[PDB]
Design an enzyme around this catalytic site. Sequence first.
Site, PDB file in Angstrom:
ATOM      1  CG  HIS B  40      -5.272 -15.069   1.022  1.00  0.00           C
ATOM      2  ND1 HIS B  40      -4.220 -15.651   1.596  1.00  0.00           N
ATOM      3  CD2 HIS B  40      -5.288 -13.755   1.477  1.00  0.00           C
ATOM      4  CE1 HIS B  40      -3.611 -14.761   2.364  1.00  0.00           C
ATOM      5  NE2 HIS B  40      -4.256 -13.633   2.286  1.00  0.00           N
ATOM      6  CD  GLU B  52       5.960   2.178  -3.502  1.00  0.00           C
ATOM      7  OE1 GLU B  52       6.533   3.009  -2.807  1.00  0.00           O
ATOM      8  OE2 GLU B  52       4.944   2.453  -4.125  1.00  0.00           O
ATOM      9  CG  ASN B  54       6.110   6.742   2.957  1.00  0.00           C
ATOM     10  OD1 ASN B  54       4.956   6.484   2.584  1.00  0.00           O
ATOM     11  ND2 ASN B  54       6.300   7.684   3.858  1.00  0.00           N
ATOM     12  CB  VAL B  57       6.146   9.483   0.137  1.00  0.00           C
ATOM     13  CG1 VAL B  57       7.338  10.345  -0.269  1.00  0.00           C
ATOM     14  CG2 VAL B  57       5.319  10.250   1.147  1.00  0.00           C
ATOM     15  CG  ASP B  84      -2.795 -18.597   0.723  1.00  0.00           C
ATOM     16  OD1 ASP B  84      -3.320 -18.212  -0.328  1.00  0.00           O
ATOM     17  OD2 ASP B  84      -2.733 -17.898   1.738  1.00  0.00           O
ATOM     18  N   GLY B 174      -2.849  -6.977   5.717  1.00  0.00           N
ATOM     19  CA  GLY B 174      -2.144  -6.107   4.797  1.00  0.00           C
ATOM     20  C   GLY B 174      -0.754  -6.673   4.546  1.00  0.00           C
ATOM     21  CB  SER B 176      -1.962 -11.558   2.782  1.00  0.00           C
ATOM     22  OG  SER B 176      -2.741 -12.251   3.765  1.00  0.00           O
ATOM     23  N   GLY B 177       0.843 -12.456   1.474  1.00  0.00           N
ATOM     24  CA  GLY B 177       1.507 -12.555   0.192  1.00  0.00           C
ATOM     25  C   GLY B 177       2.963 -12.183   0.270  1.00  0.00           C
TER      26      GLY B 177
HETATM   27 CA   LIG Z   1       6.899   5.420  -2.492  1.00  0.00          CA
END
Ligand SMILES: [Ca+2]
Lengths: 29, 222
Positions: B40, B52, B54, B57, B84, B174, B176-177
């Site tokens: 989805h 990643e 943050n 930033v 899914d 946020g 999901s996946g």
């Molecule tokens: Ca970053």
Amino acid sequence: RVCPKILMECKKDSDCLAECICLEHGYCG
Amino acid sequence: IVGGYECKPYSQPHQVSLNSGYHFCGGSLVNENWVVSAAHCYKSRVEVRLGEHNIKVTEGSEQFISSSRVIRHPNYSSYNIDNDIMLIKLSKPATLNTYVQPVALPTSCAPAGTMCTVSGWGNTMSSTADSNKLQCLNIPILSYSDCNNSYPGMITNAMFCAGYLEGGKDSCQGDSGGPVVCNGELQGVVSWGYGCAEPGNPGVYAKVCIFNDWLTSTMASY
Ligand SMILES: [Ca+2]
């Protein structure tokens, strides 16, 4: 209310997937 | 992630952010060229952001790589969010280093009661937990009896529940996946739920162990 956990901006419920609704903050949930 | 804690930076080095203007879903690096996420979360082109902690930033650890192919499972069903799972091929291989490392695909399905970690940059439903810094949460896989009791007749063989029936701890919009990792293997992909962290409504996850055949044959290309 099957709602997938994707972050999606919305103005109306119809913007959202499955049975998610557009919550007050302008995002589906 | 609701009820979790900020992850130790780079402790989940397989975690990626899918970005098309802003972060909208997570994913998991499974080797230098491929990312697993939820079907989805499909968009025809996405930017994958690796290394990643943050997301708002620039920290120096990041690799941003465009997708070259986004492939949903052939039997994905948008009505009920079944099967899914999706593969994203990177236009260039990721550099594996201290910040970026793949997660192993499962050798078998994990049994109910196994403790796992889920992570992501989604909604925390908290004024003190910052969703821009990667959040981590330890959740047990629940039995099929508990999962189907929470969501009568809605749970297919491609789904499992994990979390706490009391509520308070869960993945949320946020996330999901993103990964559910158990004993060093990717067992689940964040998929759907009724709200987040509500009593009797644990999160539902795509069951990766039944997709090994499709995942490994597709990652071979043609
Ligand atoms: Ca970053």
